[PDB]
Amino acid sequence: SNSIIVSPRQRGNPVLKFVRNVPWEFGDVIPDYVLGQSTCALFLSLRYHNLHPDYIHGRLQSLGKNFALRVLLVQVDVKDPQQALKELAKMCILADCTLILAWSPEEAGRYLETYKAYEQKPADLLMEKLEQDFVSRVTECLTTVKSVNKTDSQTLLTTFGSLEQLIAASREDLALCPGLGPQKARRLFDVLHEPFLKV
């Protein structure tokens, strides 16, 4: 079932009209949305929160521990959400559910789509890339210095041919590199060849 199950109680909602990249249909479920197995969602609006103070608590208590990941996504439409957010976060901590903030119905629909679309997606997107290209590797090696950055590395590889040439360069020669400056060249030279041991 590659579709979102929507609770019948959300018939007159303005957010479920903003999901376009994934299909959805209605169904009798405890949470407002069922984004696959072990994942559910409950929609709240801070307006409905401060006109119905006890509505969300009952839903969160009746939702139960059936779903592993339970997301309480809210719409920040009021102008002063500081007080409501504190109580909502405390309630989420107590009830073991995740709080996600959307500032428009467009964002809530995108969150629903992403939760549905990422049912089996791995975590390789989150982890570091660490490109294996030689330019990328030498840039990463040169970046470890305090002040050397990507553009500095790029102009370093343009001036000196190989890393052997950069090593062979003297302190004054490194300082004379266009756009390097005295302090960055000095600290690179100090890093370039200093005894590994001691301190």
Binding site: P14, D32, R47, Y55
Partner: peptide, 7 residues
Amino acid sequence: TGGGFIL
């Protein structure tokens, strides 16, 4: 039952 929305 409210759904967290205002008609």
